[PDB]
Amino acid sequence: FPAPSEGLATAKANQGGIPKQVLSDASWTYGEGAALDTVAASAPVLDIYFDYSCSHCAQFEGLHTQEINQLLSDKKITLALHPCKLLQQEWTSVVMNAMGVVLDEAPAQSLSFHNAAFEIFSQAIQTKNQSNMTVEGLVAAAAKVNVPKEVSAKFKAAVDSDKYGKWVKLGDEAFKARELEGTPTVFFKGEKVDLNKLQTPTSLTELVTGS
Ligand SMILES: O=S(=O)(O)C[C@@H](O)CNC1CCCCC1
């Protein structure tokens, strides 16, 4: 697996059990394919290593989702999302199986679904009401972001069969290979980002634009 300093440096996994658009390091991306004669082609890579069951990742997503979406709309970053199961929680496999179905069948709603799955976790942390940390809760999150019903109907079977277990295994393999220490871990243009400097909802924007 290429070093983080290499950025987006793998081809598609092209394997059974792994979403079709996922790369060989388990990541997936937004904004990488701009034409080279466009300002959009200058979009440097922002890599985010995360676990769906990590509270720090949930907080990160809540704080930065608006500006990450804005940076993508403004064609200022290529976003690369790198999943793992560092915390060894089965919730991560549940979410990854539902996310795999979304990636494969409703990719237009994938980034919104990512946010929504983290929102479930954030709300549970705050309230101690864990009742939505289920397949049925993810179906509801998918409806909230308008994943088609025919797609979210496939979540239970994917979860029950661990359809995307190979993807979960690959994300952990990639995280280990690169000897990363915790989640989240963020790189920008291949350089480590100090998470302690990202404490506002515009802090990634400031980093990307040089302030
Ligand atoms: O090449 S572009 O930058 O025009 C588009 C490219 O980022 C699309 N990638 C994701 C992949 C899987 C989830 C949905 C979109």
mmCIF file of C-alpha atoms and ligand atoms in Angstrom:
data_model
loop_
_atom_site.group_PDB
_atom_site.id
_atom_site.type_symbol
_atom_site.label_atom_id
_atom_site.label_comp_id
_atom_site.label_asym_id
_atom_site.label_seq_id
_atom_site.Cartn_x
_atom_site.Cartn_y
_atom_site.Cartn_z
ATOM 1 C CA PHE A 1 0.000 0.000 0.000
ATOM 2 C CA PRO A 2 1.457 3.365 -1.009
ATOM 3 C CA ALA A 3 2.664 5.658 1.716
ATOM 4 C CA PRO A 4 0.334 8.478 2.742
ATOM 5 C CA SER A 5 2.825 10.894 1.169
ATOM 6 C CA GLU A 6 1.865 9.466 -2.219
ATOM 7 C CA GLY A 7 -1.769 10.574 -1.930
ATOM 8 C CA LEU A 8 -4.282 8.887 -4.214
ATOM 9 C CA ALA A 9 -1.999 6.327 -5.576
ATOM 10 C CA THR A 10 -4.009 3.158 -6.128
ATOM 11 C CA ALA A 11 -6.280 1.737 -8.879
ATOM 12 C CA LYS A 12 -9.714 0.102 -8.337
ATOM 13 C CA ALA A 13 -9.853 -3.026 -6.186
ATOM 14 C CA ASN A 14 -12.084 -4.805 -8.733
ATOM 15 C CA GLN A 15 -12.938 -7.655 -6.401
ATOM 16 C CA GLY A 16 -15.996 -9.500 -5.190
ATOM 17 C CA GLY A 17 -17.036 -8.234 -1.771
ATOM 18 C CA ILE A 18 -15.627 -4.787 -2.292
ATOM 19 C CA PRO A 19 -17.633 -1.872 -3.718
ATOM 20 C CA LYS A 20 -17.038 -1.355 -7.447
ATOM 21 C CA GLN A 21 -15.721 2.194 -7.145
ATOM 22 C CA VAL A 22 -13.461 1.450 -4.129
ATOM 23 C CA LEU A 23 -9.716 1.600 -4.604
ATOM 24 C CA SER A 24 -7.094 -1.032 -3.811
ATOM 25 C CA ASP A 25 -6.542 0.516 -0.341
ATOM 26 C CA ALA A 26 -10.263 0.409 0.535
ATOM 27 C CA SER A 27 -10.733 4.158 -0.010
ATOM 28 C CA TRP A 28 -13.214 5.972 -2.210
ATOM 29 C CA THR A 29 -12.956 9.429 -3.663
ATOM 30 C CA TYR A 30 -14.735 12.569 -4.797
ATOM 31 C CA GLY A 31 -13.374 15.084 -7.314
ATOM 32 C CA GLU A 32 -10.283 13.273 -8.650
ATOM 33 C CA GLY A 33 -11.204 13.286 -12.333
ATOM 34 C CA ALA A 34 -11.170 16.954 -13.407
ATOM 35 C CA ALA A 35 -9.832 17.814 -16.903
ATOM 36 C CA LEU A 36 -6.130 18.938 -16.718
ATOM 37 C CA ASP A 37 -6.802 22.240 -18.456
ATOM 38 C CA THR A 38 -9.160 23.250 -15.559
ATOM 39 C CA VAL A 39 -8.565 24.954 -12.199
ATOM 40 C CA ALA A 40 -10.455 21.958 -10.757
ATOM 41 C CA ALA A 41 -7.507 19.706 -11.799
ATOM 42 C CA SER A 42 -5.338 21.484 -9.204
ATOM 43 C CA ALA A 43 -7.554 19.965 -6.449
ATOM 44 C CA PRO A 44 -5.168 18.499 -3.932
ATOM 45 C CA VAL A 45 -5.974 15.356 -2.018
ATOM 46 C CA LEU A 46 -7.529 15.488 1.457
ATOM 47 C CA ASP A 47 -7.341 11.971 2.937
ATOM 48 C CA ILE A 48 -9.506 11.132 5.940
ATOM 49 C CA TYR A 49 -8.929 7.853 7.810
ATOM 50 C CA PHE A 50 -11.961 7.095 9.964
ATOM 51 C CA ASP A 51 -13.970 4.469 11.857
ATOM 52 C CA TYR A 52 -17.773 4.730 11.948
ATOM 53 C CA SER A 53 -17.619 3.669 15.622
ATOM 54 C CA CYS A 54 -15.080 6.359 16.653
ATOM 55 C CA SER A 55 -16.477 9.281 18.642
ATOM 56 C CA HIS A 56 -13.689 11.578 17.548
ATOM 57 C CA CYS A 57 -14.509 10.759 13.906
ATOM 58 C CA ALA A 58 -18.198 11.475 14.589
ATOM 59 C CA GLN A 59 -17.287 14.873 16.080
ATOM 60 C CA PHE A 60 -14.966 15.540 13.136
ATOM 61 C CA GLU A 61 -17.645 14.753 10.618
ATOM 62 C CA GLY A 62 -20.155 16.957 12.418
ATOM 63 C CA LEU A 63 -17.773 19.924 12.572
ATOM 64 C CA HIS A 64 -16.366 19.713 9.053
ATOM 65 C CA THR A 65 -19.118 18.270 6.841
ATOM 66 C CA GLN A 66 -20.362 21.648 5.646
ATOM 67 C CA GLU A 67 -16.908 22.914 4.620
ATOM 68 C CA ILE A 68 -15.829 19.588 3.111
ATOM 69 C CA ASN A 69 -18.964 19.650 0.926
ATOM 70 C CA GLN A 70 -18.207 23.301 0.093
ATOM 71 C CA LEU A 71 -14.597 22.606 -0.824
ATOM 72 C CA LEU A 72 -15.848 19.895 -3.174
ATOM 73 C CA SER A 73 -18.474 22.191 -4.705
ATOM 74 C CA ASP A 74 -15.762 24.848 -5.220
ATOM 75 C CA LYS A 75 -13.450 22.207 -6.805
ATOM 76 C CA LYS A 76 -10.714 22.923 -4.246
ATOM 77 C CA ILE A 77 -10.068 19.391 -2.948
ATOM 78 C CA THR A 78 -10.162 15.782 -4.003
ATOM 79 C CA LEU A 79 -11.699 13.984 -0.987
ATOM 80 C CA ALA A 80 -10.510 10.478 -0.203
ATOM 81 C CA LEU A 81 -12.323 8.530 2.529
ATOM 82 C CA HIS A 82 -10.428 5.626 4.110
ATOM 83 C CA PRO A 83 -12.544 3.309 6.306
ATOM 84 C CA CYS A 84 -11.275 1.026 9.033
ATOM 85 C CA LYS A 85 -12.457 -0.976 12.027
ATOM 86 C CA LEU A 86 -9.782 0.111 14.505
ATOM 87 C CA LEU A 87 -12.158 0.024 17.482
ATOM 88 C CA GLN A 88 -13.296 -3.551 16.713
ATOM 89 C CA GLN A 89 -17.004 -2.710 16.992
ATOM 90 C CA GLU A 90 -19.508 -4.689 14.961
ATOM 91 C CA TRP A 91 -21.471 -1.437 14.311
ATOM 92 C CA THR A 92 -18.646 -0.569 11.904
ATOM 93 C CA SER A 93 -19.333 -3.715 9.873
ATOM 94 C CA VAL A 94 -23.074 -2.976 9.901
ATOM 95 C CA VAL A 95 -22.501 0.540 8.576
ATOM 96 C CA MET A 96 -19.857 -0.591 6.059
ATOM 97 C CA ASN A 97 -22.194 -3.210 4.621
ATOM 98 C CA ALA A 98 -24.962 -0.629 4.155
ATOM 99 C CA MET A 99 -22.435 1.879 2.747
ATOM 100 C CA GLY A 100 -21.247 -0.767 0.278
ATOM 101 C CA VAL A 101 -24.786 -1.122 -1.063
ATOM 102 C CA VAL A 102 -25.093 2.665 -1.318
ATOM 103 C CA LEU A 103 -21.756 2.968 -3.147
ATOM 104 C CA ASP A 104 -22.694 0.259 -5.565
ATOM 105 C CA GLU A 105 -26.370 1.151 -6.157
ATOM 106 C CA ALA A 106 -26.936 4.791 -5.111
ATOM 107 C CA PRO A 107 -23.539 6.531 -5.339
ATOM 108 C CA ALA A 108 -25.207 9.958 -5.717
ATOM 109 C CA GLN A 109 -26.284 9.731 -2.076
ATOM 110 C CA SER A 110 -23.071 8.201 -0.768
ATOM 111 C CA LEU A 111 -21.502 11.297 0.853
ATOM 112 C CA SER A 112 -24.830 12.290 2.455
ATOM 113 C CA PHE A 113 -25.273 8.733 3.732
ATOM 114 C CA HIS A 114 -21.784 8.824 5.207
ATOM 115 C CA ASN A 115 -22.794 11.909 7.120
ATOM 116 C CA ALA A 116 -26.089 10.417 8.159
ATOM 117 C CA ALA A 117 -24.475 7.247 9.541
ATOM 118 C CA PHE A 118 -22.160 9.370 11.652
ATOM 119 C CA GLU A 119 -25.172 11.456 12.775
ATOM 120 C CA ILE A 120 -26.745 8.292 14.190
ATOM 121 C CA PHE A 121 -23.644 7.731 16.308
ATOM 122 C CA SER A 122 -23.433 11.362 17.382
ATOM 123 C CA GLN A 123 -27.045 11.412 18.475
ATOM 124 C CA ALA A 124 -26.505 8.158 20.462
ATOM 125 C CA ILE A 125 -23.437 9.599 22.252
ATOM 126 C CA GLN A 126 -25.417 12.695 23.251
ATOM 127 C CA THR A 127 -28.601 11.018 24.348
ATOM 128 C CA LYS A 128 -27.599 7.461 25.265
ATOM 129 C CA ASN A 129 -30.502 6.373 23.069
ATOM 130 C CA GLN A 130 -28.837 3.673 20.962
ATOM 131 C CA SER A 131 -32.104 2.397 19.464
ATOM 132 C CA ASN A 132 -31.259 3.564 15.908
ATOM 133 C CA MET A 133 -27.866 1.787 15.872
ATOM 134 C CA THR A 134 -29.430 -0.965 13.809
ATOM 135 C CA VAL A 135 -30.092 -1.938 10.201
ATOM 136 C CA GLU A 136 -33.540 -0.338 10.583
ATOM 137 C CA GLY A 137 -31.869 2.877 11.774
ATOM 138 C CA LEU A 138 -29.638 2.884 8.697
ATOM 139 C CA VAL A 139 -32.670 2.319 6.455
ATOM 140 C CA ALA A 140 -34.178 5.394 8.137
ATOM 141 C CA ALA A 141 -30.975 7.378 7.610
ATOM 142 C CA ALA A 142 -30.967 6.329 3.986
ATOM 143 C CA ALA A 143 -34.546 7.607 3.624
ATOM 144 C CA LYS A 144 -33.521 10.902 5.287
ATOM 145 C CA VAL A 145 -30.972 11.432 2.478
ATOM 146 C CA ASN A 146 -33.262 10.024 -0.209
ATOM 147 C CA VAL A 147 -31.480 6.831 -1.079
ATOM 148 C CA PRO A 148 -34.024 4.978 -3.263
ATOM 149 C CA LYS A 149 -36.221 2.540 -1.309
ATOM 150 C CA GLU A 150 -35.188 -0.335 -3.620
ATOM 151 C CA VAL A 151 -31.604 0.268 -2.542
ATOM 152 C CA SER A 152 -32.061 0.644 1.211
ATOM 153 C CA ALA A 153 -34.219 -2.540 1.092
ATOM 154 C CA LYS A 154 -30.971 -4.414 0.344
ATOM 155 C CA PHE A 155 -29.203 -3.339 3.541
ATOM 156 C CA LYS A 156 -30.492 -6.165 5.778
ATOM 157 C CA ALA A 157 -29.332 -8.921 3.396
ATOM 158 C CA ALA A 158 -25.944 -7.311 2.943
ATOM 159 C CA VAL A 159 -25.474 -6.978 6.685
ATOM 160 C CA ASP A 160 -26.740 -10.544 7.442
ATOM 161 C CA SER A 161 -24.492 -12.067 4.761
ATOM 162 C CA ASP A 162 -21.514 -9.713 5.528
ATOM 163 C CA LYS A 163 -21.508 -9.033 1.800
ATOM 164 C CA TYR A 164 -18.700 -6.487 2.143
ATOM 165 C CA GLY A 165 -16.605 -8.229 4.773
ATOM 166 C CA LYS A 166 -13.670 -8.215 2.381
ATOM 167 C CA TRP A 167 -13.864 -4.447 2.223
ATOM 168 C CA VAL A 168 -13.811 -4.166 6.024
ATOM 169 C CA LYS A 169 -10.775 -6.464 6.120
ATOM 170 C CA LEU A 170 -8.987 -4.421 3.410
ATOM 171 C CA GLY A 171 -9.521 -1.108 5.203
ATOM 172 C CA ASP A 172 -7.970 -2.556 8.349
ATOM 173 C CA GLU A 173 -5.117 -4.021 6.253
ATOM 174 C CA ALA A 174 -4.419 -0.654 4.661
ATOM 175 C CA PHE A 175 -4.572 1.222 7.966
ATOM 176 C CA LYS A 176 -2.090 -1.275 9.502
ATOM 177 C CA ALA A 177 0.237 -1.217 6.509
ATOM 178 C CA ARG A 178 0.669 2.529 6.832
ATOM 179 C CA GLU A 179 1.297 2.240 10.577
ATOM 180 C CA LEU A 180 -1.257 4.838 11.494
ATOM 181 C CA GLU A 181 -1.836 5.374 15.182
ATOM 182 C CA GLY A 182 -5.463 6.389 15.634
ATOM 183 C CA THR A 183 -8.639 7.817 14.122
ATOM 184 C CA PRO A 184 -9.265 10.216 12.638
ATOM 185 C CA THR A 185 -5.973 10.642 10.781
ATOM 186 C CA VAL A 186 -5.910 13.377 8.129
ATOM 187 C CA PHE A 187 -3.438 14.137 5.335
ATOM 188 C CA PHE A 188 -3.475 17.063 2.921
ATOM 189 C CA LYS A 189 -1.241 16.905 -0.125
ATOM 190 C CA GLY A 190 0.344 13.861 1.487
ATOM 191 C CA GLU A 191 1.370 15.828 4.637
ATOM 192 C CA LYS A 192 0.010 15.000 8.087
ATOM 193 C CA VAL A 193 -2.539 17.490 9.420
ATOM 194 C CA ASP A 194 -2.431 18.434 13.120
ATOM 195 C CA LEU A 195 -5.944 17.642 14.318
ATOM 196 C CA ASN A 196 -5.494 20.062 17.206
ATOM 197 C CA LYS A 197 -5.349 22.914 14.709
ATOM 198 C CA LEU A 198 -8.744 21.974 13.253
ATOM 199 C CA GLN A 199 -11.122 23.244 15.876
ATOM 200 C CA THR A 200 -13.421 25.442 13.832
ATOM 201 C CA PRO A 201 -15.860 24.726 10.987
ATOM 202 C CA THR A 202 -13.669 26.670 8.583
ATOM 203 C CA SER A 203 -10.311 25.249 9.616
ATOM 204 C CA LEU A 204 -9.954 22.868 6.624
ATOM 205 C CA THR A 205 -10.827 25.742 4.285
ATOM 206 C CA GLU A 206 -8.101 27.863 5.880
ATOM 207 C CA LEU A 207 -5.593 25.044 5.473
ATOM 208 C CA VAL A 208 -6.549 24.452 1.827
ATOM 209 C CA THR A 209 -6.465 28.143 0.855
ATOM 210 C CA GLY A 210 -3.319 29.063 2.914
ATOM 211 C CA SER A 211 -5.693 31.081 5.100
HETATM 212 O O1 LIG B 1 -14.029 11.831 -11.492
HETATM 213 S S1 LIG B 1 -14.917 12.797 -10.893
HETATM 214 O O2 LIG B 1 -14.137 13.652 -10.037
HETATM 215 O O3 LIG B 1 -15.690 13.631 -12.051
HETATM 216 C C1 LIG B 1 -16.075 11.899 -10.098
HETATM 217 C C2 LIG B 1 -15.587 10.902 -9.035
HETATM 218 O O4 LIG B 1 -15.081 11.540 -7.884
HETATM 219 C C3 LIG B 1 -16.760 10.046 -8.583
HETATM 220 N N1 LIG B 1 -16.348 9.222 -7.430
HETATM 221 C C4 LIG B 1 -17.294 8.796 -6.348
HETATM 222 C C5 LIG B 1 -17.060 7.300 -6.195
HETATM 223 C C6 LIG B 1 -18.086 6.458 -5.433
HETATM 224 C C7 LIG B 1 -19.117 7.346 -4.789
HETATM 225 C C8 LIG B 1 -19.685 8.462 -5.658
HETATM 226 C C9 LIG B 1 -18.705 9.301 -6.442
#
